Amino acid sequence: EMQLQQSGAELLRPGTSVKLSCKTSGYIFTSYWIHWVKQRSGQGLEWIARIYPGTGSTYYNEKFKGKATLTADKSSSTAYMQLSTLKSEDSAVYFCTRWGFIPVREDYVMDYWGQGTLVTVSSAKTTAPSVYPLAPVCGDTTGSSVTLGCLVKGYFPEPVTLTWNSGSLSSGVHTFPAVLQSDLYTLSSSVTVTSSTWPSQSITCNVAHPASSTKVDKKIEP
Amino acid sequence: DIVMTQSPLTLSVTIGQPASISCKSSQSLLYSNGKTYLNWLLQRPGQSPKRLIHLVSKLDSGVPDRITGSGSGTDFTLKISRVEAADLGVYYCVQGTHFPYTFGGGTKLEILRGDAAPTVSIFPPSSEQLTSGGASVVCFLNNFYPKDINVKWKIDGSERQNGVLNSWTDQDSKDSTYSMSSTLTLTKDEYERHNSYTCEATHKTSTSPIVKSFNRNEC
Numbered sequence: 001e002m003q004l005q006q007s008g009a010e011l012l013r014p015g016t017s018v019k020l021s022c023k024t025s026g027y028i029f030t031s032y033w034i035h036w037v038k039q040r041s042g043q044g045l046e047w048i049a050r051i052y053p054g055t056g057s058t059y060y061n062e063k064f065k066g067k068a069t070l071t072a073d074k075s076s077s078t079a080y081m082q083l084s085t086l087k088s089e090d091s092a093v094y095f096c097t098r099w100g101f102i103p104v105r106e107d108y109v110m111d112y113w114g115q116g117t118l119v120t121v122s123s124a125k126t127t128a129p130s131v132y133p134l135a136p137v138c139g140d141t142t143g144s145s146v147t148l149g150c151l152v153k154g155y156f157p158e159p160v161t162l163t164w165n166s167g168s169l170s171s172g173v174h175t176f177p178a179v180l181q182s183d184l185y186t187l188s189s190s191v192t193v194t195s196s197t198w199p200s201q202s203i204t205c206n207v208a209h210p211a212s213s214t215k216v217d218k219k220i221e222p
Numbered sequence: 223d224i225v226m227t228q229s230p231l232t233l234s235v236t237i238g239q240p241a242s243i244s245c246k247s248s249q250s251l252l253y254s255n256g257k258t259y260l261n262w263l264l265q266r267p268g269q270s271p272k273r274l275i276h277l278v279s280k281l282d283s284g285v286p287d288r289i290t291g292s293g294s295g296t297d298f299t300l301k302i303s304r305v306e307a308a309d310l311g312v313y314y315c316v317q318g319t320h321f322p323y324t325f326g327g328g329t330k331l332e333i334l335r336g337d338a339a340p341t342v343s344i345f346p347p348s349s350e351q352l353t354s355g356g357a358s359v360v361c362f363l364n365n366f367y368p369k370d371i372n373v374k375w376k377i378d379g380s381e382r383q384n385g386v387l388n389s390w391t392d393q394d395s396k397d398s399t400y401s402m403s404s405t406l407t408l409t410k411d412e413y414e415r416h417n418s419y420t421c422e423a424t425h426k427t428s429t430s431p432i433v434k435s436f437n438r439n440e441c
């Protein structure tokens with residue numbers, strides 16, 4: 001089982017640099033090209049560069065010469081990409097991929113991708129979120145089924161992790177994309193259950209904000 | 223660099239019907255070895271991209287043959303013979319004939335389903351929040367279709383445009399519906415100066431606005 005694991009989200013100050021890692025396993029690292037791709041604001045992909053770990057040979061998209069530097073540690077089967085002097089345009093999600101094109105065969109083997117690494121270039125300060133339980137009064141949806149919510153507001157930077165009943169309750173869950181306003185994000189999630197479950201059995205909102213090492217559970221009491 | 227143009231930008235198709243996406247290049251993609259390096263990728267919601275086709279029409283392993291690719295020169299087409307729920311996502315064509323490699327802008331494929339009226343839930347500020355001096359009123363408009371909806375907040379009969387924060391989810395791969403959240407944030411003091419808080423929606427499924435509200439008082 002071929003796998004590529006990328007490092008976590010990064011918050012970088014303007015003008016500084018970062019080194020992203022792409023740890024691979026399940027195949028002979030030195031025998032295939034590893035490519036790096038950039039994605040900005042949703043649909044919008046760009047090819048950055050490729051490296052052949054076996055020789056260390058690299059090819060860069062002109063646009064990125066001086067911006068990105070690719071390396072690869074054969075002893076650990078890890079490819080790295082250093083981004084230098086970060087600015088606005090560098091905020092994006094970066095993916096590494098064992099693309100699979102075999103130049104000699106002029107054919108392809110399966111492409112395997114890493115999960116992506118989100119880089120945020122900002123000088124805004126890290127802020128812990130405030131989690132607020134949303135019990136219904138009118139958001140009851142009468143009997144039959146009732147819907148509860150969880151409001152996570154005023155945090156920076158992304159991401160935040162929100163689960164219900166520690167992940168036990170996954171169906172009928174809606175987690176909305178965080179929205180930035182005045183240097184802080186707001187995110188919310190709703191969960192719909194039957195009148196029979198709540199308030200009879202407890203529903204708890206679990207939130208984690210790695211950047212500030214915040215972990216909080218809010219029980220939706222009536 | 224080669225410019226890759228994809229059309230349409232978005233396509234809505236019912237499960238079971240065919241779909242086709244076009245990709246035009248600014249230069250012929252015929253390489254000097256006679257091979258044409260044009261690939262098609264699919265990026266499903268919340269997932270990394272995945273290659274579907276290479277060399278214009280060769281399917282990657284594990285890719286359903288419902289998907290077909292064709293074209294040459296500067297014109298290429300990806301066709302899905304019978305759309306299934308799992309086809310939801312953004313499709314991209316990417317060329318490797320000319321360096322540097324360039325991608326098209328993507329085509330979002332959305333599943334066309336029967337119209338669904340929103341299930342709206344409204345929530346007054348939590349005690350915890352009021353304690354901090356803030357007050358947010360939240361309204362969830364769950365599982366509706368089409369995505370096009372307009373929500374307005376009204377306090378004591380007048381529209382409130384300032385302090386509103388809206389968020390939408392992508393199309394759900396379980397029922398093909400959309401959901402949206404709307405939060406109105408005020409100071410605790412102003413919150414305690416008004417009576418009725420209304421979350422009002424305009425959607426295809428109704429000739430009149432869809433409403434949900436509450437009156438804050440005491441007891």
Ligand SMILES: O=C(O)CNC(=O)CCCP(=O)(O)OCc1ccc([N+](=O)[O-])cc1
Pocket residue numbers: 035036037047097099101103259260261316317318319320321323
């Ligand atoms: O490099 C050149 O100049 C000549 N062309 C070639 O060698 C063929 C490259 C074919 P291919 O690998 O399909 O290149 C396109 C290509 C490569 C990587 C990628 N990616 O998303 O990771 C997307 C697209």
Ligand SMILES: [Zn+2]
Pocket residue numbers: none
């Ligand atoms: Zn051949």
Ligand SMILES: [Zn+2]
Pocket residue numbers: 107108276280
């Ligand atoms: Zn092949």
Ligand SMILES: [Zn+2]
Pocket residue numbers: 319320321
């Ligand atoms: Zn060329």
Ligand SMILES: [Zn+2]
Pocket residue numbers: none
């Ligand atoms: Zn040439």
Ligand SMILES: [Zn+2]
Pocket residue numbers: 377378380
């Ligand atoms: Zn008034």
Ligand SMILES: [Zn+2]
Pocket residue numbers: 378
């Ligand atoms: Zn008045």
Ligand SMILES: [Zn+2]
Pocket residue numbers: 377378415416417
């Ligand atoms: Zn008023």
